[PDB]
Structures are given as C-alpha cells and as structure tokens.
Amino acid sequence: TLDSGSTKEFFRRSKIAVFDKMWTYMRSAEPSVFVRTTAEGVARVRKSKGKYAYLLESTMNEYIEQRKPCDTMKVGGNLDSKGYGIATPKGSSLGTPV
C-alpha cells in the first residue's frame, strides 16, 4: 500500500479474516512491500512483470487507466465506500459555511 495512508491503517485495524491475513503478509514482508509515493508504486508495478500487485483508490485507478501507455488494468470490484471531504480545524467558524 501507500505508507502513512488510510488504506494501510484500514488493513491494520481491519477485522475481516481475509484482510487480516493480507495484513499479516504485508507486515511480514521481505523486502518492504510498502512504498512512499503513488508514482513509486506505479513504476514498481509497471516493472514487476506480474509479480507485485498494488492497492489504491478507484479514482486514482481509472485516471492511471486513461493515460498512456495504458499498460495497467483494473481488476475485480470495490471493497468499501470511502469519501473525500473538506477538513477544518476543530471548532473554527469556517465549518458551517464551508
């Protein structure tokens, strides 16, 4: 996954057993299966030749699909229903007008 990432924390805190085994494999990794940025993982999968999968969010996935060289591919369905939103410091006056 992406380090310092909500997906990585999701697999940490997840309680579904298949995800638990996935988190077990990810924490028991030789070498590091994690990356530091998105394009890093992109290049890793573009060079892995079907040996390193990647996890990210569906919007990122379809944007990478709609670009050259189109050598990537979305497989399977989704897993949950996340959502982007606007973030404010807790209690400021900008919250309700935003």
Partner 1 sequence: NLAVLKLSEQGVLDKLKNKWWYDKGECGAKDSGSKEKTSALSLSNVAGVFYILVGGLGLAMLVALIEFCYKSRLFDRGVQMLLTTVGA
Ligand X SMILES: N[C@@H](CCC(=O)O)C(=O)O
Burial (CB count <10 Å: 0-12, 13-18, 19+), residue 42: middle
Nearest CB to ligand X, comparing residues 3 and 65? 3
Question: What's the angle, vertex CA 29, arms to CA 74 and CA 36, rounded to 5?
Answer: 60
Among all residues, whose Cβ is closest to ligand X? 5
**Are the C-beta atoms of 41 and 48 separated by less than 8 Å?**
no
Amino acid at 83: G
Applying CB under 6 A, among 6, 37, 72, 88 the residue interacting with ligand X is 6
Count of chain residues binding partner 1 (CB under 8 A): 6
8 contacts ligand X (rule: CB under 6 A): yes
Nearest CB to partner 1, comparing residues 16 and 39? 16
Residues 24-83 that bind ligand X (CB under 6 A): 57
Residue 8: partners with Cβ closer than 8 Å, 6 or more residues away:
1, 2, 34
Specify the residue for token string 């805190």.
13
Residues 49-88 that bind partner 1 (CB under 8 A): 80-81
5 contacts ligand X (rule: CB under 6 A): yes
Q: Which residues bind ligand X (CB under 6 A)?
A: 2, 5-8, 57
